[PDB]
From a paper:
The T = 16 icosahedral HHV-6B capsid structure contains 12 pentons, 150 hexons, and 320 triangular triplexes. Each of the 60 asymmetric units of the HHV-6B capsid contains 16 copies of the major capsid protein (MCP); 16 copies of the smallest capsid protein (SCP), each atop an MCP; five and one-third triplexes (Ta, Tb, Tc, Td, Te, and one-third of Tf); and 12 copies of pU11. As a result, we derived the atomic model of both the HHV-6B capsid and its capsid-associated tegument complex of pU11 tetramer. Beyond the capsid, the helix-rich tegument protein pU11 forms tetramers, bridging the space between the upper domain of the hexon MCP and the triplexes Tb, Td, and Te.
Only the N-terminal one-third of pU11, referred to as pU11nt below, is resolved in the cryoEM density map, indicating the rest of the protein is flexible. A pU11nt tetramer binds atop triplex Tb, Td, or Te, but not Ta, Tc, and Tf. Atop the triplex, four pU11nt subunits cluster into a tetramer in a “VΛ”-shaped, dimer-of-dimers configuration and their subunits can be classified into four types based on their relative locations in the dimer-of-dimers: pU11nt-a-1, pU11nt-a-2, pU11nt-b-1, and pU11nt-b-2. Through this structure, the N-anchor anchors Tri1 and the entire triplex from inside the capsid and beneath the MCP floor region, simultaneously sealing the hole at the local threefold axis where three neighboring MCP P-subdomains encounter one another. Our SCP model encompasses residues 23–83 of the 89 residue-long SCP and consists of three α-helices and two connecting loops, folded into a triangular spiral with the N-terminal helix (H1) pointing outwards. Our model shows that SCP’s helix H3 contributes the largest number of interacting residues between SCP and MCP, inserting itself into a groove in the upper domain of MCP. CATC exists as a group-of-four subunits in HHV-6B, but as a group-of-two subunits in MCMV and a group-of-three subunits in HCMV; it is arranged in a “VΛ” formation in HHV-6B, “Λ” in MCMV, and “Δ” in HCMV. Conceivably, the rigidity of the helix-rich pU11nt tetramer may have made it impossible to extend in order to span a longer distance, or to shrink in order to prevent clashes, thus explaining the absence of pU11 above triplex Ta in HHV-6B.
Residue numbers in the entry:
A (entry chain s): 530 to 577
B (entry chain s): 50 to 433
C (entry chain E): 2 to 49
D (entry chain S): 1 to 299
E (entry chain a): 2 to 296
F (entry chain s): 1010 to 1344
G (entry chain W): 1 to 296
H (entry chain t): 194 to 241
The structure:
């Protein structure tokens, strides 16, 4: 349930012991998770 | 000189309701108060027969089931105008002048032919509204076949394994038996699937001896009706089994009148018991639960004879025709011509993992080594 | 809703109403006004 | 042709069409039980498809109706009131043209001397303490059938020609000669004119003063008539452009026009009213098909 | 001309009794047509499914008013009204009818706590409120005030000022306008209406300025003086920083006037309110009233 | 990567069977009425009909028989979302002007606050394509991983939500377990050890839910005339109503043939009046779509055109080619 | 009475009488309100010889009394004076697709390049005014008022650069244009009152409204909103910012001011808005004849 | 042969989708059934 | 051009104007939209 | 107009003459061969 | 409105008997021939 938008990394943070859902944009293409963009895929885009 | 030749006019053919073979599906009975009827309903009483259980098995109890079927209702209308000048020339002559005589006779023929055209239009609207209701009712063939295959035990309504396999069977029946006349050519196979339709469809309630009866008392059983583009191919592939025979068919509508009993109960209790006088006089006697004829459904009407294109499907004589002769020149479409909407999906840019990558069909194609050829970026496919 | 009318009043028999065994129909709610009872229910006899 | 015969045929056709609208054929089984009075009433059996004018009964305290219980045919005004006991109250056009500003002082005092009592004084005080005029008092229709009991019964016509019953002595709208004016290049252009009522306000340094005008013009189109009335009222319009900002009273326009209905050009005649000896000049419109349109304001 | 309506679902006895309570009412109808189903009867096929309030106000102007006459066994007889003739209207709205009042149709104050006169399988029946014209103007102005001030923040009296807007009174019948704190049940949101008003009040002064700064040599004599007064009273310090310091295009002026005139003839809906009915008499206990039909 | 979805409309002749005397019709004597106007006198003849359906089981069936034509292009004109949700914008004027510039929308400044009924209520196109050769086309859009397995997903009839959403495997009248089927990933999907293949379509609040579900489409304004062929998969208020028992599901389905969807005017619109006779949508009923014969390049497409093998799917190294599931080209060539 | 008989003064031809048989059910306005008329008062040609000014033709066409053609017989020509709220069938002339449900007005003829194939007979023509939807009638009246406001700005070739961009408009896939506006002073009065009302909207505009622009720019954000931000950025020729933003229960004054602003807007709309003459109910499939239930 | 299949349906006018699919059908009928006696030999086909 | 795609253009019955110019897809009696079909490239052609 | 059986060189044209496959269009690296849409040679051989 | 014979189209003329080469196509008897016997020896070709 963490992945909701492929541009936006989502998480839970604690401020004053409230669970605080948190959206934060993945800016660069590599900051997408490696099961969602494997390293051979980055090498293939690099060879492009 | 400019010579103008003879004026040729059209003759519109006349559509009796009981000439078209939709009237074997129909059973039409005049009743002059459905403008005030709220809900017509028929009430059916089914008691189920059970099997005797073996030793030390809990016997299922005697099961009594009632189902009530309601009435939909649907109006039709026809409007036609008369112009003010035609209405002036209709009724009187101002003087005995020749042009007044000619336009008087023309306006009289205009009014008479317009009334004839409106009566024909009400008959064809009855055809179209009943065909509308049949297509609103009728579920498709793959659903009907899958529901005939899947039945239930007493214990619980359609277990999850049953309905999941039912869904997968719906997938399979849809993807095989979709485009029916076009894929195969086997008269054996196509006759088999029409046999599957006629065994899948359940039978009606009323068994009249004379409603659509052939010679020597064999009743015709249903109608198969399509458009003419289907039925030309169907005759060309099933000409062995198609005949034409004379069937004793009704010609007039049934007719029902209230009594003072029914009108009084309609005033007092907002309701009508049909078959009320038989329902009254069979009360104190022994024959309570038996009653023979339903006056609202079985009523004496005039009979005639006519020809029908029939088929023989395992000792089943079925009328078989197209309604194009009543949708020859009509603003509404033949409603058997219907549209599908199939949804398609396809990818682009899916990176197959190089780490577990392979290729079959190596001998067929061979790429030129470029990373635009080694990564999919676009997707190619054919149009219509 | 009137079911003792069915339970008491005259009825016309009819041949081959059904094919797919109304156990399935009633179990999967095909109908609009249905009513089932297993043992002989006495509430047809309480005529008021 | 014969001519005389066809004329009689057309007259018989019109009389029979009047009977077809008036009576109704009965398809009851019509048995011989009833008495002869019910017999002849079941043969005739009237219905009200004959008058085709729309009236309204109205109750008003009779202190307010000083010339209008005698002179049939007047504009009437509905004044809603915060008193629960009488929620609406009815008002003569002359009763409101008293404190209209268009009327000269001689005619104003003369009419007031008709309209001097305690009830009318209190109602004029209420009308003056009201902020604007046009949506606390409003146009209501044309007078017929004054009864003058204790609380006088007034019929009043919303639509159609003005008559009580019998379709005899069809009364006419009576407009005070001073308050009306016809803005057009050719007065009485070709044929039947439309009669309007124009409410125009004015501000003499302290308060608002209303003015009640009646216009007669050949134009049907309301945009055309407000376009001719702006050209007529452009100066005082300018004075209100200065007033309506510094004021805080809840109004947003200079005036409003509303159609009374049709008239006829040859059915315009002068005259004078008299109540208690006060001769008062009027322009008596004779036959009026009353047709109230909506109020259309202009700023 | 009459209209038959046959319902789509079945009706309860309480529903048929509701219709017999509502046997005279106005119903708007999209298609001027003889046979109409309950799938298109009423106004709920338009409101709640499509842009609301201003297109709703245009649509309530442009639909066909049609009154209930008689309820059959299960069908509805709706007679559509002819101009210049009498009809009879029952009183559904809260405000009391009086004689000689003009009547109009306002959209319903669509709180979703209403009793929902019919609710027949995801379809419901919504009628417009027949109301006097003065109250209709007042309701329109209060709604535009609510829709304007609901966008402002940091008023610490915002609750009491919305409450003083929502409470209106007319002939001793109070009602609260249900567009409270933007509950969004049906706020109607009126966002083009307030946007259009403020486009008018913002594009007005500079358009009248660019027109009036030209051709004063001709003796108009009234317009030039009036605009100077009207503009420099309210906007007393007129055009100091100027934005662009008088570099305008004739095409830009063209686009300014064309836009500011589009806004007016498209807010034409909230411009006027037509008198659908002029009630001549009102029956006792204010149940129903016989009126005449206009527009 | 992206699953592109597209619907196509087919002209189909389609026959009916019905048992004899299956349903009775009761009628009134046709009533005459006359409206006498000043230019015409119009006579209206009205007639009331009622239908009682006497058979208990389905006494009338209907099978798809033969294709006439395909009114769809099967083109590629994708859904212009800048005309589908034409109210939205990026913040800066330079950014928004450059995005409209590069994606090539016409009329980049809407003048909505001036004239909003033009474009909130639905941008009227005002101009069809001047040339048109194959009928209607419209292609919707789902954004996705470059990771999602082809052979699990793309080569078979399957829901493009990623997680399958067919209510013929859910407890009827159990909306809690229904929403757990549409959303839960503590549980698994069937058919794989993978409860998801599109974690931006299947997941709640993902770019399936925030973009195509009408529960959020009615919040974020849009053209109602714009036809989106993925609302039929992602509207969940119109699948929790399908969470009923099976005969109610198919009665609701065969009653859903009012066919508001036209097949006129150069592109798929969705008008909603129900004038057309009939449509039948088995993809709507089965809640999945179909795979069609696409490929990754012309190299694989040429050998497909040689052997005709549009049924068997085959893959190169990173170039894939999907097999078609209904050989409708062969169907058209057979008639 | 209601019926009017038109009798042509000049003789005609069989092609002419065939055109009049084609031309049936067309609204023709007459100025006379008599029972007999000649060809001198049929149609609109007895006014379109006087300066051919479109505003002038529109004004007198408002003053006209409209009738409907009925039953061309001999050289006589029946005209029904249509009653209020009744239903009549109208054959259409305006080049439009005529979607039902809308209101119609009656507009002067927009001069196309091809001459009328209707009736030209002995220095007399049959000038039939068009019937158009009310929205495009208001659009034309906007364009005329706009050319008045801009042709006050006296220029050379800028009038042309405005007019050639402006005049050709497209409504329901139909291009129309109206030439040769000599820009008389009659439009200047109809424009002076728009100028008055814009001055008063400015002076009586409340404090909520100009604030509402900036407040909604800070709260919401949209491209459509930006278009309005682009207008307010493109012209900043007022710049007079107010002092207070407290709104400390001035609410009756606010109601009074908003009522005034709406009423001035209604006045400008009453300028630009033309009277609905017809209400369409039923349209033929040809879009050639259609029924209405309303006659001025 | 193409006109009898693509007869105008009872609507307002002949539609663009109708005539475009009619044009594609013209292409297909022309490229299939052009040289008639010479390609096939099925007496059933030629009789058809 | 030496760039024009074979498989989109040359392998099919196709107009050698490049842009296809068949009047069976154009609005009849509409010369303006006709010349837009023969000349315009703000619009796209079909088939690509 | 119609496409006819052309090719880029004799290499492609000889294999076309071998298999008779004048309908299917096939490509080499930069050499191409266009498939014929009416097999008029086979038409003339059939009569 | 009724009219029986059209003299410009129907007129009494003498009849005879002759042979034709016929085909049967679904109860349709069709004459079937070539005009080469009248284009045997001319200055024109057979226009088919």
């Amino acid at each position: 349930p963490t992945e909701r938008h492929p541009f936006f990394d989502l998480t839970y943070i604690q401020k004053n012991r409230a669970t605080e859902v948190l959206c934060t944009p993945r800016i660069m293409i590599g900051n997408m998770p490696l099961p969602l963009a494997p390293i051979s895929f980055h090498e293939a885009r690099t060879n492009q | 000189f400019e010579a103008l030749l003879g004026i040729y006019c059209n003759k519109i053919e006349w559509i009796n309701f009981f000439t078209t073979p939709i009237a074997v599906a129909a059973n039409v009975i005049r009743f002059n108060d459905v403008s005030r009827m709220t809900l017509g309903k028929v009430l059916f009483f089914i008691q189920l027969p059970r099997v005797a259980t073996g030793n030390d098995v809990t016997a299922p109890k005697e099961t009594t089931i009632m189902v009530a079927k309601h009435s939909e209702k649907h109006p039709i209308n026809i409007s036609f105008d008369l112009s003010a000048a035609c209405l002036e020339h209709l009724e009187n002559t101002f003087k005995n002048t020749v042009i007044d005589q000619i336009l008087n006779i023309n306006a009289l023929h205009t009014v008479l032919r317009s009334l004839k055209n409106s009566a024909d239009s009400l008959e064809r609207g009855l055809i179209h509204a009943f065909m509308q209701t049949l297509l609103r009712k009728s579920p498709p063939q793959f659903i009907v076949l899958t529901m005939n295959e899947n039945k239930v035990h007493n214990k619980q309504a359609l277990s999850r394994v049953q309905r999941s396999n039912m869904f997968q069977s719906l997938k399979n029946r849809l993807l095989t038996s979709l485009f029916f006349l076009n894929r195969n050519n086997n008269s054996s196979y196509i006759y088999r699937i029409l046999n599957d339709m006629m065994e899948s469809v359940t039978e009606s309630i009323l068994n009249d001896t004379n409603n659509y009866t052939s010679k020597e008392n064999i009743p015709l059983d249903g109608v198969l009706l399509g458009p003419i583009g289907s039925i030309q191919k169907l005759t060309n592939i099933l000409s062995q089994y198609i005949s034409t025979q004379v069937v004793s068919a009704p010609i007039s509508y049934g007719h029902f009148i209230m009594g003072k009993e029914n009108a009084v109960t309609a005033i007092a209790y907002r309701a009508i018991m049909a078959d009320f006088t038989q329902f009254t006089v069979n009360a104190g006697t022994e024959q309570q639960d038996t009653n023979n004829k339903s006056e609202i459904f079985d009523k004496s009407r005039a009979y005639a004879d006519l020809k029908l294109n029939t088929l023989k499907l395992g000792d089943k004589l079925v009328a078989f025709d197209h309604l194009h002769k009543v949708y020859k020149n009509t603003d509404v479409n033949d409603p058997l011509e219907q549209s599908l909407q199939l949804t398609f999906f396809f990818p682009l840019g899916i990176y197959i993992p190089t780490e577990t990558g392979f290729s079959t069909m190596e001998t067929r194609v061979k790429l030129n080594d470029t990373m635009e050829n080694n990564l999919p970026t676009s997707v190619f496919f054919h149009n219509k | 809703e009137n079911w003792q009318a069915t339970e008491i009043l005259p009825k016309i028999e009819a041949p081959l109403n059904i094919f797919n065994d109304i156990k399935t129909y009633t179990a999967e709610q095909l109908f609009d006004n249905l009513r089932i009872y297993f043992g002989d229910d006495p509430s047809r006899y309480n005529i008021s | 042709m014969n001519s005389k015969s066809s004329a009689r045929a057309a007259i018989v056709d019109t009389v029979e069409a009047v009977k077809k609208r008036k009576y109704i054929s009965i398809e009851a089984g019509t048995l011989n039980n009833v008495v002869e009075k019910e017999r002849k009433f079941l043969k005739q059996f009237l219905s009200g498809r004959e008058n085709l004018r729309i009236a309204a009964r109205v109750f008003t305290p009779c202190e307010l109706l000083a010339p209008e219980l005698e002179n049939l045919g007047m504009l009437m005004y509905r004044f809603e009131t915060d008193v629960d006991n009488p929620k609406i109250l009815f008002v003569g056009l002359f009763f409101l043209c008293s404190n209209a500003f268009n009327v000269s002082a001689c005619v104003r005092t003369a009419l007031t001397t008709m309209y001097t009592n305690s009830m009318v004084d209190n109602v004029l005080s209420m009308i003056n303490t009201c902020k604007y005029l046009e949506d606390k008092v409003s146009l209501f229709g044309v007078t017929s059938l004054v009864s003058c009991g204790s609380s006088c019964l007034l019929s009043c016509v919303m639509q159609g020609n003005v008559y009580d019953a019998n379709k005899e002595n069809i009364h006419g709208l009576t407009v005070l000669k001073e308050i009306f004016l016809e803005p057009d290049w050719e007065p009485r252009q070709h044929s039947t004119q439309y009669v309007y009522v124009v409410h125009v306000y004015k501000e003499v340094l302290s308060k608002l003063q209303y003015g009640i005008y009646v216009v007669l013009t050949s134009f049907q189109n309301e945009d055309l008539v407000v376009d001719i009335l702006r050209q007529y009222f452009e100066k005082e319009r300018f004075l209100f452009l200065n007033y309506l900002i510094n004021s805080n009273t809840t109004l947003s326009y200079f005036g409003s026009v509303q159609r009374i209905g049709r008239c006829a050009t040859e059915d315009i005649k002068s005259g004078f009213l008299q109540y208690r000896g006060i001769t008062l000049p009027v322009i008596k419109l004779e036959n009026i098909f009353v047709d109230l349109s909506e109020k259309k304001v202009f700023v | 001309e009459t209209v038959y309506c046959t319902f789509d679902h079945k009706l309860s006895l309480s529903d048929i009794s509701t219709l017999c309570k509502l046997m005279n009412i106005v119903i708007p109808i999209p298609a001027h047509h003889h046979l109409i189903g309950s799938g298109n009867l009423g106004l709920y096929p338009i409101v709640s499914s499509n842009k609301d309030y201003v297109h709703i106000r245009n649509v309530l102007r442009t639909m066909v008013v049609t009154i209930l006459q008689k309820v059959e066994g299960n069908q509805l007889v709706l007679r559509k009204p002819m101009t210049g003739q009498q009809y009879a209207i029952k009183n559904t709205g809260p405000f009391p009818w009086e004689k000689g009042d003009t009547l109009t149709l306002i959209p319903p104050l669509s709180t979703h706590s209403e009793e929902k006169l019919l609710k027949l399988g995801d379809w419901e029946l919504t009628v417009p409120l027949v109301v006097p014209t003065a109250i209709a103007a007042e309701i329109n102005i209060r709604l535009l005030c609510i829709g304007l001030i609901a966008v402002h923040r940091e008023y610490n009296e915002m609750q009491t000022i919305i409450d003083e807007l929502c409470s209106i009174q007319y002939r001793d019948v109070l009602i609260k306008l249900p567009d409270i704190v933007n509950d969004k049940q049906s706020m109607y949101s009126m966002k083009t209406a307030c946007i259009s008003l403020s486009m008018i009040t913002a594009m007005a002064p500079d358009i009248v300025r660019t027109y009036i700064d030209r051709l004063t040599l001709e003796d108009h004599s009234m317009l030039l003086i009036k605009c100077q007064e009207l503009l420099s009273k309210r906007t007393t310090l007129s055009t100091q920083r100027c934005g662009q310091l008088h570099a305008t295009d004739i095409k830009d002026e063209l686009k300014k006037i064309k836009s500011v005139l589009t806004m007016i003839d498209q807010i034409n809906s909230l411009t006027n309110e037509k008198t659908y009915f002029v009630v001549c008499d009102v029956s006792a206990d204010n149940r129903m009233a016989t009126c005449i039909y206009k527009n | 990567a992206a699953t592109l979805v597209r619907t196509d409309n087919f002209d189909v002749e389609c026959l009916l069977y019905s048992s004899r005397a299956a349903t009775s019709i009761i009628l009134d004597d046709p009533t005459v009425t006359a409206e006498a106007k000043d230019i015409v006198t119009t006579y209206n003849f009205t007639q009331h009909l009622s239908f009682v359906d006497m058979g208990l089981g389905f006494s009338s069936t209907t099978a798809t028989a033969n294709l006439k034509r395909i009114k769809s292009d099967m083109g590629s004109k994708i859904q212009n979302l800048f005309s589908a949700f034409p109210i939205h914008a990026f913040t800066n004027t330079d950014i928004n002007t450059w995005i409209r510039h590069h994606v090539g929308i016409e009329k980049p400044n809407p003048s909505e606050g001036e004239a909003l009924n033009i474009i909130t209520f639905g941008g009227i196109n005002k101009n069809p394509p001047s040339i048109l050769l194959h009928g209607q086309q419209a292609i919707c859009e789902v954004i996705l991983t470059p990771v999602t397995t082809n052979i699990n997903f793309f080569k078979l009839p399957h829901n493009p939500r990623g997680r399958e959403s067919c209510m013929m495997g859910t407890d009827p009248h159990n909306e809690e377990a229904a929403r757990k089927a549409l959303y839960d990933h503590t549980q698994t999907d069937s058919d794989t050890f993978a409860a998801t293949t599109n974690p931006w379509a299947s997941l709640p609040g993902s770019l399936g839910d925030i973009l195509y579900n009408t529960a959020h489409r009615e919040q974020l304004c849009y053209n109602p005339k714009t036809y989106s062929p993925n609302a039929q998969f992602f509207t969940e208020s119109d699948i929790l109503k399908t969470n009923k028992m099976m005969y109610k599901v198919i009665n609701e389905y065969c009653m859903k043939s009012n066919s508001c969807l036209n097949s006129d005017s150069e592109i798929q619109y969705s008008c909603s009046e129900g004038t057309d006779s009939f449509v039948s949508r088995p993809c709507q009923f089965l809640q999945n779509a179909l795979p069609l014969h696409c490929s990754s390049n012309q190299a694989l497409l040429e050998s497909r055109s040689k052997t005709g093998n549009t049924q068997i799917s085959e893959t190169h190294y990173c170039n894939y080619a999907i097999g078609e599931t209904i050989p409708l080209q062969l169907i058209i060539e057979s008639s």
